[PDB]
């Protein structure tokens, strides 16, 4: 038997993922001291 409709469940998460503090950053780091920032617990937009 075939499925009837598709359901997608994502959480609410009332914040956009802050890629603006890692992409639009005035001081990018160096390669011996590369800045690592974990981004989590949000809804991300990869279309931009």
């Amino acid at each position, epitope marked *: 038997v075939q499925p009837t409709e598709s359901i997608v469940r994502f959480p609410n998460i009332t914040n956009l993922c*802050p890629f*603006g*503090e890692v992409f*639009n*950053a*005035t*001081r990018f780091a160096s390669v011996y001291a590369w800045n690592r920032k974990r981004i989590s617990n949000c809804v991300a937009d990869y279309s931009v």
Partner: antibody, heavy 118, light 107 residues
């Protein structure tokens, strides 16, 4: 002696196109960039973008992506900005700023271009 | 996009006292928050760069401190002739936004 002299107080129609000047002297002009901020008298400083000394690409800010145009004329030490299609909400001064690519603090120096529109 | 607020809006102080003004951040400006002041009818001048260091050639009656999202400078010896509107400036994320200002006033 390092200083950044400016143009005078401009007064034009809402829709004219005026070009303000920022003449530099004293330092290595190709070394540090030519940042520009705006300040309404009831508000604070707002950065509008900059332009590199060697290529001339006018990279604006995230808000003022439109009618602001930076114009470069090298080997005479000028940092010309031009505003076109002026609006009545742009009653603000336009401060020029020598500002480097790495340190990114200003030491902004402009005597005040009183761009009054009515 | 980065909302840079600072409190109190209008606080008064007297001659020779010690005052503390803050600058509260919404997002992370972890080290890059600079300090300016603006006299009326005057192009501004640096006070504290990189939130701890002081520029050479300023009167050192004040020092800046703080990290994270809370930043301050403390005027250890206040003088009446300033009447300056203190300005915040972050150097971390584009666009470079500023603060509204803490106007210092005499009683």
């Amino acid at each position: 002696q390092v200083q950044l002299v400016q143009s005078g107080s401009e007064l034009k129609k809402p829709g004219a196109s005026v070009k303000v000047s920022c003449k530099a002297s004293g330092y290595t002009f190709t070394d540090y960039g030519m940042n520009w901020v705006r300040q309404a008298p009831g508000q604070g400083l707002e950065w509008m973008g900059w332009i590199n000394t060697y290529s001339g690409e006018p990279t604006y800010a995230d808000d003022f992506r439109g009618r602001f145009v930076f114009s470069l004329d090298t080997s005479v030490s000028t940092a010309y900005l031009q505003i076109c299609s002026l609006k009545a909400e742009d009653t603000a001064v336009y401060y020029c700023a020598r500002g480097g690519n790495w340190d990114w603090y200003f030491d902004v120096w402009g005597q005040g271009t009183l761009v009054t529109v009515s | 996009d980065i909302q840079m607020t600072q409190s109190p809006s209008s606080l008064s102080a007297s001659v020779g006292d010690r005052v503390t003004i803050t600058c509260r951040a919404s997002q992370s400006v972890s080290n890059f928050l600079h300090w300016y002041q603006q006299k009326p009818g005057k192009a501004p001048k640096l006070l504290i760069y990189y939130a701890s260091q002081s520029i050479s050639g300023v009167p050192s009656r004040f020092s800046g401190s703080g990290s994270g999202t809370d930043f301050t400078l403390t005027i250890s010896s206040l003088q009446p002739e300033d009447f300056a509107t203190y300005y915040c400036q972050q150097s971390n994320t584009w666009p470079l936004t500023f603060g509204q200002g803490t106007k210092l006033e005499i009683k």
